[PDB]
Amino acid sequence: LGKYEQYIKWPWYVWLGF
Numbered sequence: 739l740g741k742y743e744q745y746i747k748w749p750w751y752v753w754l755g756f
Contacts, residue, residue, distance in 0.1 A: 747755070
């Protein structure tokens, strides 16, 4: 759907993409 990778991309950024 693209709802998780949209809200989960926040905490995952701190590691990669922060």
